[PDB]
Amino acid sequence: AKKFKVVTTFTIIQDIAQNIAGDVAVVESITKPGAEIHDYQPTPRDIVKAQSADLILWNGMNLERWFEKFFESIKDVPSAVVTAGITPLPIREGPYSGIANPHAWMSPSNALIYIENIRKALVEHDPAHAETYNRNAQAYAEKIKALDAPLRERLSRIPAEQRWLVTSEGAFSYLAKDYGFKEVYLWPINAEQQGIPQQVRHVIDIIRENKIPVVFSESTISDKPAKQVSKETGAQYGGVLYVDSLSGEKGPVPTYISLINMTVDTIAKGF
Numbered sequence: 001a002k003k004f005k006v007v008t009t010f011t012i013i014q015d016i017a018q019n020i021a022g023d024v025a026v027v028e029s030i031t032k033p034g035a036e037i038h039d040y041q042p043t044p045r046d047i048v049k050a051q052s053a054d055l056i057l058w059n060g061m062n063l064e065r066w067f068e069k070f071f072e073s074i075k076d077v078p079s080a081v082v083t084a085g086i087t088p089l090p091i092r093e094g095p096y097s098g099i100a101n102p103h104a105w106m107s108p109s110n111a112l113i114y115i116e117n118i119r120k121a122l123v124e125h126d127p128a129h130a131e132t133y134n135r136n137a138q139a140y141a142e143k144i145k146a147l148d149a150p151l152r153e154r155l156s157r158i159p160a161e162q163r164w165l166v167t168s169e170g171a172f173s174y175l176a177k178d179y180g181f182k183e184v185y186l187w188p189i190n191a192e193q194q195g196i197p198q199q200v201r202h203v204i205d206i207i208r209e210n211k212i213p214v215v216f217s218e219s220t221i222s223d224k225p226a227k228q229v230s231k232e233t234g235a236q237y238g239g240v241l242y243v244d245s246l247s248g249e250k251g252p253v254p255t256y257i258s259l260i261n262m263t264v265d266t267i268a269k270g271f
């Protein structure tokens with residue numbers, strides 16, 4: 001009858017977990033494709049959705065500023081933090097300086113740890129299907145491992161001293177570390193915050209000093225600040241990167257694998 005039901009906070013975790021669950025469990029996201037996830041405002045329908053689950057998965061590293069308060073309304077549903085075991089990169093400036101940068105899934109090596117944590121939770125809370133979760137998790141892990149060679153090759157035309165990744169949210173720190181990019185951003189983490197107009201001027205200074213050719217925005221936030229930086233510098237506006245959300249299932253970024261690939265492909269063509 002009713003399959004084992006997993007509810008995740010946002011769409012990246014939904015897609016990773018659905019690959020591990022296969023056709024044995026149904027995984028749904030609370031947030032919809034395109035919605036801003038850090039300061040999402042949960043609704044009554046979200047409470048009912050989470051309460052209907054057999055297992056709830058969230059990122060932790062205080063990504064979902066809303067989750068802990070929201071979860072107080074949910075009874076008798078186990079939960080698992082899918083970043084357990086990942087070493088955080090700290091936020092480097094701003095009102096959240098020192099807090100973990102939550103965007104750990106942008107490193108495919110970290111995604112292997114996400115996969116293991118989700119496998120572990122599925123096997124613990126749905127032991128009847130442990131054989132399928134284990135098989136699916138190892139197969140999906142191999143798919144993630146296979147991305148490393150083509151991703152590095154795609155970015156190989158960019159010499160080291162020109163590998164500057166200028167985005168809007170500083171959401172790419174884990175990807176930048178993996179592939180040897182220096183990061184510049186218009187704000188360190190999504191939030192209601194001050195200091196964005198001034199940081200735009202500082203980013204402007206860095207674009208000049210380093211001859212950076214391209215700047216980007218992201219799919220759940222406004223492209224206006226990055227477009228302004230591009231007009232106030234030589235740099236081109238390189239388009240929309242994906243980090244905090246997948247697209248719709250018919251969109252360009254329907255899966256976690258497509259998110260990593262499209263983000264790297266878009267950076268590469270921006271150079």
Ligand SMILES: [Zn+2]
Binds near residue numbers: 103190244
């Ligand atoms: Zn973000």
